């Protein structure tokens, strides 16, 4: 008969899921950003150009004024179109003369014989082209699209665990177990060899596997604990829906006091842990200790939860069990993100080196 | 005594191996090539060279004829020997005096200004020399030798699981369990505290751990299931070698319905799960619930499989249990395949940007 | 009642730690070589410098001697104090004329006409300027600072397992169990529901969980094994501290005969396996089978170990159980080291191409 500690293995696997919820999942990565460097290189290119070129960006009416594209349109073969928005962004601070003087000495390029400036201007244009050729590689924006945020991943984890965007408090305010569809008795709520459960998320599955009730409190109700039962007082025959005080007495079995560095292989190992413990039967798969008939909490029956999406003839948990599929989505986004962050580090290092050399007057006069 | 659900741990470990078999293991890595981009750069260098240099790769007779090295030997005062094959290969279309002009304009290099051509040629030159340097990296071919195919890996996995190159069908057609060595009774087949099993692959080990028979169907035969026993009807004392019908009744407990991305970490975890469940003794190591004397399937004996290659005094499974060593070989070959990928595509991104710059007419004119 | 094999799950998780100890944990990742490439480009740049420049790094008394800065202070009208230490590292070998002539030959610079030498020198100084700027990326300096060694992590793992820098021999010489604080009986040594154990490391936690004593050898003392009990002969009511012979009879249950590839994900998984197996109560957390009151080894009580640092209301094992926090440091170091190796890949490959380019005479003369 199912007694004390007989569900420690299933509790450990499920708690590996519950501990990821809340704000406890951390991305802990460096968003690669080379836009400031690029915008500065482009400013250096415009700062070092000939005034004739910058005068193409002034307004014919007023000097320190953006060229009104409606007033002075662009030529035909000019190809200046579409590059104007990037150029004007670099030219807008330099339309003022005082700033242009300031940027000249900031970039350490003011006060040189024309030949020296000619030499520096040529390399900077070449350098600026190399920086643009990398920043505009179609691999970028591809990787940038595959970037996620810590908050988007946290919301998905809390949806897979609680079906909410945030982890409920210790009273589970704004939370109702089993979507409010618990009905008759624990076997109807938690499932059987012929029927699925009413638990759609991870937390309610954990309650089906670990909660004690008024009947098993001295035997099967200690399957996830050691010396003292959870003491939920759950009486599903009378009141089916567990109250928040009961849910918290089961969640406290899981580590809700730490943090986890979000890795894709970390999610994979936790989902694999849960999925491999499902025992595949003719009509359902069972997670937890099961002896006979159903998941009623009876010490001769089972302390478990049942799913109809996975059987000994079909089903992959991370694809067909909804809450597991949601967490597998988080793993997939973590993968795309980790590959994107890595791929965007190469142009970031290149553009930093371009900017560093462009501000070395010695390297420019070689 | 051994009862329902007592081998869920071992079933999860062994099914983590089984699900890797068939064609379910995917090598989703991208085999890199940059030969496309490199060859185009080399053509550009020759398309931009002096016609005296293109005339070097022609026969002294017909202009469209290539130079016969036997007819015209190479100048021994020059290094023109080693690089002659790559030069001609790129030049071979350019020997045609019409393809040259087409390519000359196709690379935005046909035009005017013999001075501005020489400018372009000089930059194409440097870009080419840097491109061949970025890809020259000696340690190649041996790195391409440390490359495998998804098919070769899957054949090794199936050899670890089934001793075959392909997974048997749902009738185990063409499959003989235990290498056709089963005899006497279940303990002789599956081992004991003093002797090993006849099972040399993973599937047959899972059968020893999880099969019910004609005696334990109401007790220990339910060790890996929840509701109903597998139902093999195995009777080794009458017929030792089980049928495919019986074998499939156990394999249906594992997930044969999905896929698994092949990573060396994925193989390592699954091998450690099985390896650390081996209970090390003086003469054998036992996988599965063991109580008394042998792995006979009796509820007072054991539902297990025994190995003599690792004990409490010797042996590491990933090197001394043949089927685990074969699966570890997939892990070693995959960590080499991964390591060679990075060291064969690092030029790929650098070569691609060089082509964009070499095809930019402005970049040629600095 | 606690019987044969009831602690296999706990043995496998704790043996996942013990097997990391000794010199079995391996840092198989390639060790970066970034500074060595940079140091080589610096030495090449010095060989190519004018003899007047190299003469600035010798004192006036014996050319073979390095210039003493106190004897010949650097010109306060130069930035030479900013580059002297690196400059001197490159000059010192070349101070000897043979070593200089040999380097000029190795780098294909010896026997060069003045114009060709100056042309090559200028290109080498441009490549050298690019290599230095690349090393100035803060991510490069951070990555080299985040690189670990295998020996450092091996000492840390052994400190988590044995509280020692080296794994004790098969008689545990120099090792005293429970830091010499065992007393009274097994329940005070291994803990209870109200009190923590005297086990500060992982090896003594494995002993509490798996050691038979002179009273449970036929029942609970087989919780970690199959047929034959460990046979320690432990009698904590007479002599509390177990002898090294007893400790080894438990350690022989783990695989100490192989190796483990070190990785942050591999350490995280092994820690999680132990951390979530801890059954969290109001006053202690228990690892192992538990039925009644304490971890006394009695079949009606428990084969377990107790911690007071984690409860159902507080604590994360990897931060609050000291030996687990030690092992978690290894993971964090492996995290930064793995990111550092990845970030140093492209710049080290980029410096390598600079070295081969600076050793191609054709490229230097373009
Ligand atoms: C690869 O190898 C090359 C050599 O092949 C090597 O190049 C060397 O680069 C360094 C700089 O990194 C050069 O150092 C310069 O040296 C000159 C000359 O100093 C001598 O001559 C002066 C008189 O002209 C004497 O007074 C003096 O005693 C020395 O004998 C210095 O003049 C340079 O310093 C000036 O500029 C610095 C900034 O760049 C200032 O910090 C410094 O205060 C000096 O300022 C002077 O000029 C200012 C105007 O700009 C003026 O305002 C000040 O009042 C002041 O007068 C500088 O130290 C060295 O010459 C190069 N070696 C050569 C060409 O042979 C590379 O370093 C090497 N690569 C790497 C990475 O190691
Ligand atoms: C890309 O195209 C451009 C051409 O526009 C080039 O960059 C390159 O083609 C060729 O690259 C090779 C590799 O360096 C160059 O070879 C060198 O040619 C030198 C001159 O050739 C000889 O010409 C006549 C015929 O014999 C002779 O009278 C001359 O005296 C002269 O020797 C040649 O001197 C040199 O040989 C040297 O080889 C080693 C170099 O250190 C030493 O053993 C020794 O110094 C020896 O002298 C070498 O063979 C070639 O010039 C160049 N083509 C042109 C037109 O410049 C293309 N690159 C790629 C890979 O696509
Ligand atoms: C950086 O600044 C320098 C100028 O000092 C240039 O390298 C470049 O400014 C302009 O670059 C564009 C091309 O990107 C040139 O436009 C060309 O105009 C031609 C007609 O006159 C047309 O036929 C071509 O197709 C181009 O569109 C423009 O001349 C040039 N400005 C000059 C030379 O003053 C800047 N580059 C970047 C990356 O911002
Ligand atoms: C679960 O199975 C037990 C034993 O057959 C039964 O008593 C319960 O009623 C059932 O829910
Ligand atoms: C396994 O051990 C049990 C108990 O001793 C015995 O009854 C069986 O015959 C044996 O195979
Ligand atoms: C552990 O619990 C059992 C059963 O109550 C008791 O007999 C032992 O004395 C205790 O250590």
From TrEMBL, chains A, B, C:
Transmembrane segments: none
Lineage: Eukaryota, Discoba, Euglenozoa, Kinetoplastea, Metakinetoplastina
Keyword terms: Cell membrane, Glycoprotein, GPI-anchor, Lipoprotein, Membrane, Signal
Entire protein: shown range: 24 to 389 of 470
Boundaries of every Trypanosome variant surface glycoprotein B-type N-terminal domain copy: 1-352
Protein name as catalogued: Variant surface glycoprotein
Purpose: VSG forms a coat on the surface of the parasite. The trypanosome evades the immune response of the host by expressing a series of antigenically distinct VSGs from an estimated 1000 VSG genes.
Cell compartments where the protein resides: Cell membrane
Residue positions with a glycan: 45, 301
A cellular component annotation (GO) from this entry: side of membrane
Region of interest called Disordered, as start-end residue ranges on this chain: 57-76
Record has Signal as a keyword: yes
Biased composition (Basic and acidic residues): 57-70
Membrane topology: Lipid-anchor; GPI-anchor
Disulfide bond annotation, renumbered to this chain: 15-254, 190-208, 210-224, 295-304
């Amino acid at each position: 008969n199912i007694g004390t500690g007989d569900n420690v293995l299933h509790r450990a696997a499920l708690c590996g899921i519950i501990e990821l919820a809340g704000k406890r999942a951390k991305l802990e990565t460096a968003l690669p950003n080379f836009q400031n460097e690029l915008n500065s290189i482009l400013e250096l290119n415009m700062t070092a150009a000939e005034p004739t070129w910058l005068d193409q960006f002034r307004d014919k009416d007023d000097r320190s004024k953006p060229r009104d594209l409606t007033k002075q349109p662009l030529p035909k073969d000019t190809n200046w179109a579409d590059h104007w928005t990037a150029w004007a962004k670099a030219a807008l601070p330099l339309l003022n003369d005082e700033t242009h003087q300031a940027k000249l000495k900031e970039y350490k390029l003011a006060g040189l014989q024309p030949e020296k400036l000619e030499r520096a201007r040529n390399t900077i244009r070449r350098l600026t082209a190399e920086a643009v050729a990398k920043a505009q590689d179609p691999t970028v924006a591809e990787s940038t699209a595959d970037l996620t945020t810590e908050e988007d991943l946290q919301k998905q984890i809390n949806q897979a665990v609680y079906s909410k965007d945030t982890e409920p408090d210790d009273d589970f305010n704004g939370y109702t177990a089993f979507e409010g569809k618990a009905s008759t008795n624990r076997q109807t709520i938690c499932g059987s060899a012929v029927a699925g459960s009413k638990a759609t998320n991870a937390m309610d599955a954990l309650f089906c596997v670990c909660a004690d009730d008024r009947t098993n409190g001295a035997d099967a109700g200690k399957a996830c604990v050691a010396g003292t039962a959870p003491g939920t007082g759950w009486n599903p025959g009378v009141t089916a829906t567990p109250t928040g005080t009961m849910l918290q007495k089961v969640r406290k079995l899981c580590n809700t006091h730490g943090k986890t560095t979000l890795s894709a292989a970390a999610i994979e190992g936790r989902l694999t842990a849960v999925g491999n413990l499902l025992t595949r039967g003719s009509a359902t798969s069972i997670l937890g200790s099961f002896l006979a008939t159903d998941c009623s909490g009876d010490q001769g029956s089972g302390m478990c939860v049942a799913y109809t999406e996975v059987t000994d003839a079909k089903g992959t948990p991370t694809k067909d069990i909804p809450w597991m599929q949601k967490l597998d989505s988080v793993r997939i986004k973590l993968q795309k993100h980790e590959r994107a962050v890595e791929k965007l580090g190469k142009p970031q290092h290149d553009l930093k080196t371009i900017l560093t050399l462009a501000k070395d007057p010695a390297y420019l006069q070689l």
